[PDB]
Design a binder for this molecule. Structure first.
Ligand code: A17
Length: 343
């Protein structure tokens, strides 16, 4: 049966949600869209409801909406945000103009944690572990995050973590680059899933040291900052950059050796430093994977091959179809009423 909705103004718009969701309350962030913390009396969980902004204003948004929804309904892992529900006040396609999403709530993100807790070695392991485990899931479904960062890691009171914003296209017109992998920033050859490991590395290094590893100002400064630690590229990596300008420009810079991670991260679990040198490598191909990373002896106290699941193949076949603004809209509708809540 169709539930009974109610109305109220939150974040300057009409919010019409089913009565199971009570005590809606804005998060204060805004960086994640329009989102409220709520209590779901159906599951009895604390949830996070997000009202999609004019989801179908144009092909770009239309397809973007269906894309996110597809991703959310497909992902079912304890370290990745997933769909507890999705609903619309509309009774028929005709109406349909808004999409509402629901997920578990955490209330905070990594970014807003270095400024608080002092972070012991132990908690760092737990946090990096969850990112790698969730990453392994995501990667198995052939989905790349591409822009992983501390602000995309939703963490709750008990340092439990969920990865957010995965697989969402690119940017329009900017974007922080303090964690993006160099392969991406200078746009080189085909780039594998390992781009995310580069990011995990930056984060891990940040959690260990309390300061941002590569807080560059603009594009060349970032590259300056990274090459000063991992060193400039040899002929092996240069030859693989099946690019042009980027290759000729990269090699223009002054050659530099890789620093000694051991003395860069003064005082830090040695096993931690070992992992960083395996993640922060210029060459993605020679960079460690999430699965490999979960076996490293640093995560000794948490590793458990049986409890580190994989995803089913993600049917990404819609990413090539050219559709009308109304068709992308309709598919998002189909995806909404065919939805089935998890157990
Ligand atoms: C609702 C929603 C829908 C979809 C996706 C998403 O990543 N979609 C991409 C396609 C994958 C993300 C969210 C999202 C945003 C902020 C959340 C906060 C939260 C609350 C306050 C301050 C900071 C945070 C992080 N706490 N718990 C869960 C949260 C979930």
């Amino acid at each position: 049966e169709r539930p009974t909705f109610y109305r109220q103004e939150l974040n300057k718009t009409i919010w019409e949600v089913p009565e199971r969701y009570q005590n809606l309350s804005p998060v204060g962030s805004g960086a994640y869209g329009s989102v409220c913390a709520a209590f779901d009396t159906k599951t009895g969980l604390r949830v996070a409801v997000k009202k999609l902004s004019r989801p179908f204003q144009s092909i770009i948004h239309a397809k973007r909406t269906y894309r996110e929804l597809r991703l959310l309904k497909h992902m079912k892992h304890e370290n990745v945000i997933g769909l507890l529900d999705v609903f619309t006040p509309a009774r028929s396609l005709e109406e349909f103009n808004d999409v509402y999403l629901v997920t578990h709530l955490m209330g905070a993100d990594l970014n807003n944690i270095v400024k608080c807790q002092k972070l012991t070695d132990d908690h760092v392991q737990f946090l990096i572990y969850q990112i790698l485990r969730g990453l392994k899931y995501i990667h198995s479904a052939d989905i790349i995050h591409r822009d992983l960062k501390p602000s995309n890691l939703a963490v709750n009171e008990d340092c439990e973590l969920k990865i957010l914003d995965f697989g969402l296209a690119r940017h329009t017109d900017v974007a922080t680059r303090w964690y993006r992998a160099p392969e991406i920033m200078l746009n080189w050859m085909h780039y594998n899933q390992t781009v995310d490991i580069w990011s995990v590395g930056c984060i891990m290094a940040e959690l260990l040291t309390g300061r941002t590893l590569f807080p560059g100002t603009d594009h060349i400064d970032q590259l300056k900052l990274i090459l000063r630690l991992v060193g400039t590229p040899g002929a092996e990596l240069l030859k693989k950059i099946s690019s042009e300008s980027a290759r000729n420009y990269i090699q223009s810079l002054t050659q530099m050796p890789k620093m000694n991670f051991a003395n860069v991260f003064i005082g830090a679990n040695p096993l931690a430093v070992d992992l960083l040198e395996k993640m922060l490598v210029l060459d993605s191909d020679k960079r460690i994977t999430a699965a490999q990373a979960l076996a490293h002896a640093y995560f000794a106290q948490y590793h458990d091959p049986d409890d580190e699941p994989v995803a089913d193949p993600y049917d990404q076949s819609f990413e090539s179809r050219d559709l009308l603004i109304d068709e992308w809209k309709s598919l998002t509708y189909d995806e909404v009423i065919s939805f089935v809540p998890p157990p």
